[PDB]
């Protein structure tokens, strides 16, 4: 079984989003610097990554981890985003927020509107860094997995998150990523983001891939997080595989029927499952009843003749149209 030291934890399938393991995954908690994933997403989506940012006095004042920005410094937004993600710079976070959002209040508005759009119903942002300077800055393991799945759609996020070493284009710094999974511990790691405050304790988001299986893990309040992430990924890689549920082309269960060779699906349907889960998958097809008039005239047969529904217990894990060869 999976046993972790985290108060809340989750691991999800990066392809389908399916929850594979969860522990208190909807409990609102302080999250510390994993907040910064949202800050990075908004910077990347802003289209302003090559713009020059002017660092404010407010940005320099920020407590905690820093990249040592100075008041009035001119730094490319991209550099700040690497500093944010690799070094957890809180100064970088405020500079990004003020640049992309106009003000902290503006940026935080943007963060919450993005959370809403993603369905993060148990998440509320009050700042761009995760310092404990407000009430009601929180998220959950489940919501942070949703956010990370979204972030991993962004090629720039993929790149930044997987970067071990970065030379800034506009600052005299080289930064090493603080994600020990990526830099030293776990060969399958593809990225992630750490957090710590006195009240939040250790928080961690990380991603991993092996044999085409992409996974996302979150732990909130976990003194053993590095080990626990590896345990979680290893458990999934050991016990789950991608099964071809239905192959592209014709549909075996329609053998002997009217649709035996002319009905087809346009793509493979694959899914990440344990051996025991795969036993509980059902392929359901609903098809039009062939009409006598179709025998003589193929033109009366629609292009789509039904749908295939893959069921896992009472979850619909896939649904695709069934076509009829023209």
From Swiss-Prot:
Catalysis performed (reactions): Preferential cleavage: (Ac)2-L-Lys-D-Ala-|-D-Ala. Also transpeptidation of peptidyl-alanyl moieties that are N-acyl substituents of D-alanine
UniProt entry keywords in alphabetical sequence: Carboxypeptidase, Cell shape, Cell wall biogenesis/degradation, Hydrolase, Membrane, Peptidoglycan synthesis, Protease, Signal, Sporulation
pH effect summary: Optimum pH is 7-8.5.
Active site, renumbered: 33 (acyl-ester intermediate), 36 (proton acceptor), 88
Pathway: Cell wall biogenesis; peptidoglycan biosynthesis
Annotated positions binding substrate: 193
Entry's localization field: Forespore outer membrane
A GO molecular-function descriptor: serine-type D-Ala-D-Ala carboxypeptidase activity
E.C. number(s) listed in UniProt: 3.4.16.4
Membrane-spanning residues: none
Gene Ontology CC annotation, any one: membrane
InterPro entries, alphabetized: Beta-lactam/transpept-like (IPR012338), Peptidase_S11 (IPR018044), Peptidase_S11_C (IPR012907), Peptidase_S11_N (IPR001967)
Presence of keyword Acetylation: no
GO biological process: cell wall organization; peptidoglycan biosynthetic process; proteolysis; regulation of cell shape; sporulation resulting in formation of a cellular spore
Pfam families hit by this protein: PBP5_C (PF07943), Peptidase_S11 (PF00768)
Main location: membrane
Matching Gene3D superfamilies: 2.30.140.30, DD-peptidase/beta-lactamase superfamily
Membrane disposition: Peripheral membrane protein
PANTHER family named among the record's database cross-references: D-ALANYL-D-ALANINE CARBOXYPEPTIDASE, D-ALANYL-D-ALANINE CARBOXYPEPTIDASE DACB
Role summary: Removes C-terminal D-alanyl residues from sugar-peptide cell wall precursors. Required specifically for the synthesis of the spore form of peptidoglycan (cortex).
Similarity comment: family membership: Belongs to the peptidase S11 family.
Name this protein carries in UniProt: D-alanyl-D-alanine carboxypeptidase DacB
Taxon lineage: Bacteria, Bacillati, Bacillota, Bacilli, Bacillales
């Amino acid at each position: 079984a999976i046993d972790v030291s985290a108060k809340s934890a989750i691991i999800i399938d990066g392809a389908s989003g399916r929850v594979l393991y969860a522990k208190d995954e909807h409990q609102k908690r302080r999250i510390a610097s994993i907040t910064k994933i949202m800050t990075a997403v908004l910077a990347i989506e802003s289209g302003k990554m090559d713009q020059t940012v002017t660092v404010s006095a407010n940005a320099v004042r920020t407590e905690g981890s820093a990249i040592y920005l100075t008041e009035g410094q001119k730094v490319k937004l991209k550099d700040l985003v690497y500093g944010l993600m690799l070094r957890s710079g809180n100064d970088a976070a405020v500079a990004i927020a003020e640049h992309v959002g106009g003000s902290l209040d503006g940026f935080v508005y943007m963060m919450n509107q993005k959370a809403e759009q993603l369905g993060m119903k148990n998440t509320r942002f009050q700042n761009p860094h995760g310092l404990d300077d407000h009430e009601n800055h929180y998220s959950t393991a489940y919501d942070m997995a949703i956010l990370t799945k979204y972030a991993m759609k962004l090629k720039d996020y993929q790149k930044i998150s997987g970067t071990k070493i970065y030379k800034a284009e506009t600052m005299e710094s080289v930064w090493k990523n603080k994600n020990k999974l990526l830099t030293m511990l776990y060969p399958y790691s593809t990225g992630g983001k750490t957090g710590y405050t006195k009240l939040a304790k250790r928080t961690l988001v990380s991603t991993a891939s092996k044999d085409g299986i992409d996974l996302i893990a979150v732990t909130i309040n976990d003194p053993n997080d590095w080990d626990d992430h590896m345990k979680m990924f290893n458990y999934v890689f050991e016990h789950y595989q991608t099964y071809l549920i239905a192959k592209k082309g014709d549909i075996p269960k329609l053998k002997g029927t009217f649709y035996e060779s002319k009905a087809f699906i346009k793509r493979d349907i694959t899914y990440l499952l344990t051996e025991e889960e795969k036993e509980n998958v059902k392929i359901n097809t609903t098809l039009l009843k062939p009409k006598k008039a179709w025998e003589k005239d193929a033109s009366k047969i629609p292009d789509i003749v039904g749908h295939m529904e893959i069921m896992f217990n009472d979850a619909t894990i896939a649904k695709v149209p069934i076509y009829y060869e023209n």
